[PDB]
Design a protein around this ligand. Structure first.
Ligand SMILES: *[C@H]1O[C@H](CO[C@H]2O[C@@H](C)[C@@H](O)[C@@H](O)[C@@H]2O)[C@@H](O[C@@H]2O[C@H](CO)[C@@H](O[C@@H]3O[C@H](CO)[C@@H](O)[C@H](O)[C@@H]3O)[C@H](O)[C@H]2NC(C)=O)[C@H](O)[C@H]1NC(C)=O
Ligand SMILES: *[C@@H]1O[C@H](CO[C@@H]2O[C@@H](C)[C@@H](O)[C@@H](O)[C@@H]2O)[C@@H](O[C@@H]2O[C@H](CO)[C@@H](O)[C@H](O)[C@H]2NC(C)=O)[C@H](O)[C@H]1NC(C)=O
Ligand SMILES: *[C@@H]1O[C@H](CO)[C@@H](O[C@@H]2O[C@H](CO)[C@@H](O)[C@H](O)[C@H]2NC(C)=O)[C@H](O)[C@H]1NC(C)=O
Ligand SMILES: *[C@@H]1O[C@H](CO)[C@@H](O[C@@H]2O[C@H](CO)[C@@H](O)[C@H](O)[C@H]2NC(C)=O)[C@H](O)[C@H]1NC(C)=O
Length: 479
């Protein structure tokens, strides 16, 4: 009943059967005959002989007295890897995820061989939760450190979690059978009940239509729990501790849906918010009243169903300039659409806008490049009259705010006769200082119950302006 094993492809640690004819406490003498000629003097069963890759052996055993029918051979062997050992297991309770780190002792293992790690996670010694398999190679017999994490489906607070690990080493050039290592000694992480919250998780957020479980630690029996008028069966974890699985979570209200666990005397609970990420900002356009600042207005799409301290946030970043601007919003006192302001940079005249949107569930973006000039929108004129030199027609003078000393206009002036006709004419004027302007007409009918009206334009092509206060100051008719 002999047997040979090995943990390094280098040495074979054999151990034969019991005694045939001699009693207990006998010494032994074994020899190994292949090509060499070395013998041994043993006191037990094991022998630990050098490993023979390709080649046969000839093993002679003697009982050391009252002899011995002991003769056998050796070719392959049986490969049992050195039981791995967990380096350090830790948790991030906020995200309720596990961190494992161990070191394959590749260093004490010769050839580049492939290895199979198997990680196992139990929630209570018994129940099995995740089962991982990664495959790789014993890196040039160097100790290589491995990392593995997992975000539990249940909060790490309301149940103990053990984690073991073992491996399989397949060496392409080994002939013996290759068995699995032992399971790494157990490494567990349990939370010490030390808080106010007994219900997990607190005030989380999830994509509507997802699945989620809720913890509840306690020392007094839990009678029942419900989401919203719902009453979920109780999953019985370990000391009158309870869990509840929830499926296809539905859109929460402005205030997150509630989850209450209830006991004999008291009641506990948390809240949950199910919404959507933000929609890609639709209809992103940036115009300009004056060539000083830009107005990028946009409209959000689907309502995130998340508001308040988790209302979707917007940020306008400029490509080259690098300047940005994160608009903070009131708690929805805006209506549907909203905009933001971006001060023009001197000597730019082209902006590569990208409106960013953030949300505790997702992010979106809509970018729009522009020639600020081609996108100008003048504000309506102000405070103008109708006076001139003595004769002929009238010389108008209008006031329009901003900075346009650089370009020209196409302010079309409409002249309306005595409640009948209205021909059209336009005179071009350059940009002046932050002040009024001075135009001109030609040969107009003195009085004749005439009326005026004005609307502008720009050298660049875009929106016109709001009409101004309609005036009808008839100069002199009889003298
Ligand atoms: C304003 O528009 C520009 C467009 O101009 C750029 O277009 C890109 C595609 C490239 O040819 C670049 O040379 C032009 O200037 C937006 O450009 C964004 O550029 C970044 C570069 O970091 C792109 O991301 C990159 O993507 C590659 C592979 O996809 C990665 O390897 C890089 O690491 C990097 O992540 C990005 O796709 C471009 N944006 C989009 C979505 O078009 C620019 O983003 C925008 N203004 C800003 C700053 O937001
Ligand atoms: C998740 O639920 C929806 C339907 O939700 C409904 O409205 C809720 C507010 C609540 O009152 C629920 O009880 C209601 O049932 C499921 O939608 C159906 O999905 C099937 C396919 O799965 C589809 O054929 C039907 O047309 C859908 N019905 C409609 C219009 O809602 C959805 O299936 C559930 N989640 C999953 C993945 O099964
Ligand atoms: C490797 O070597 C020994 C040598 O005895 C193996 O024993 C042989 O096993 C095979 C398969 O069972 C048989 O066909 C042979 O008859 C056995 N002996 C001979 C002739 O060599 C042993 O099973 C192998 N593995 C171990 C445990 O080392
Ligand atoms: C930004 O837009 C303006 C308007 O298109 C550009 O200025 C014009 O440039 C063209 C050359 O293609 C000239 O013919 C026009 O006379 C210019 N407009 C006027 C009258 O001011 C400007 O070049 C654009 N920015 C850049 C450099 O791409």
């Amino acid at each position: 009943d002999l047997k040979c094993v090995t943990n390094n492809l280098q040495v074979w640690q054999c151990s034969w059967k019991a005694p045939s004819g001699t009693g207990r406490g006998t010494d032994y003498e074994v020899c190994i005959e292949q090509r060499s000629r070395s013998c041994y003097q043993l006191e037990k069963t094991s022998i630990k002989i050098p490993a023979l890759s390709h080649g046969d052996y000839e093993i002679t055993i003697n009982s050391l007295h009252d002899f011995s029918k002991f003769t056998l051979n050796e070719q392959n062997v049986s490969l049992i890897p050195d039981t791995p050992e967990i380096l350090q297991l830790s948790a991030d309770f906020s995200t309720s995820t596990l961190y494992l780190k161990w070191n394959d002792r590749g260093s004490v293992f010769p050839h580049r061989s492939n290895v199979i790690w198997e990680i196992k996670v139990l929630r209570k010694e018994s129940m099995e939760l995740v089962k991982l398999v990664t495959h790789q190679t014993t890196l040039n017999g160097k100790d290589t450190l491995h990392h593995w994490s997992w975000a539990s489906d249940m909060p790490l607070e309301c149940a103990i979690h053990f984690v073991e690990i073992r491996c399989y080493i397949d060496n392409l050039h080994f002939s013996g059978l290759e068995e699995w290592s032992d399971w790494s000694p157990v490494k567990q992480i349990s939370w010490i009940p030390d808080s106010q919250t007994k219900v997990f998780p607190q005030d989380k957020v999830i994509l509507v239509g997802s699945d989620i479980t809720f913890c509840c630690v306690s020392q007094e029996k839990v009678l029942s729990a419900l989401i919203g008028h719902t009453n979920c069966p109780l999953i019985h974890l370990d000391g009158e501790n309870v869990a509840i699985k929830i499926r296809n979570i539905s859109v929460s209200a402005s205030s997150g849906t509630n989850v209450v666990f209830t006991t004999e005397d008291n009641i506990f609970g948390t809240v949950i918010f199910a919404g959507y990420p933000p929609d890609t900002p639709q209809q992103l356009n940036c115009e300009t009243h004056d060539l000083k600042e830009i107005i990028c207005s946009w409209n959000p799409g689907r309502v995130t169903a998340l508001v308040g301290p988790r209302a979707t946030s917007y940020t306008l970043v400029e490509s080259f300039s690098g300047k940005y601007v994160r608009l903070k919003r009131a708690e929805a006192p805006t209506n549907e659409s909203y905009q933001l302001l971006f001060q023009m940079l001197p000597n730019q005249e082209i902006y590569n806008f990208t409106l960013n949107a953030h949300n505790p569930l997702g992010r979106s973006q809509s970018t729009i490049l522009v020639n600020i000039t081609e996108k100008v929108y003048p504000h309506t004129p102000t405070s103008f009259k109708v006076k001139d030199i003595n004769s002929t027609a009238v010389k108008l003078s209008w006031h329009l705010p901003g900075n346009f000393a650089k370009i020209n206009f196409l302010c079309e002036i409409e002249i309306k006769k005595s409640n009948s006709v209205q021909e059209q004419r336009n005179v071009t004027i350059q940009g002046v200082e932050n002040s009024s302007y001075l135009v001109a007409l030609d040969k107009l009918n003195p009085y004749t119950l005439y009326t005026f009206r004005i609307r502008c334009s720009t050298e660049t092509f875009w929106k016109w302006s709001k009409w101004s206060n309609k005036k009808q100051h008839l100069t002199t008719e009889a003298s």
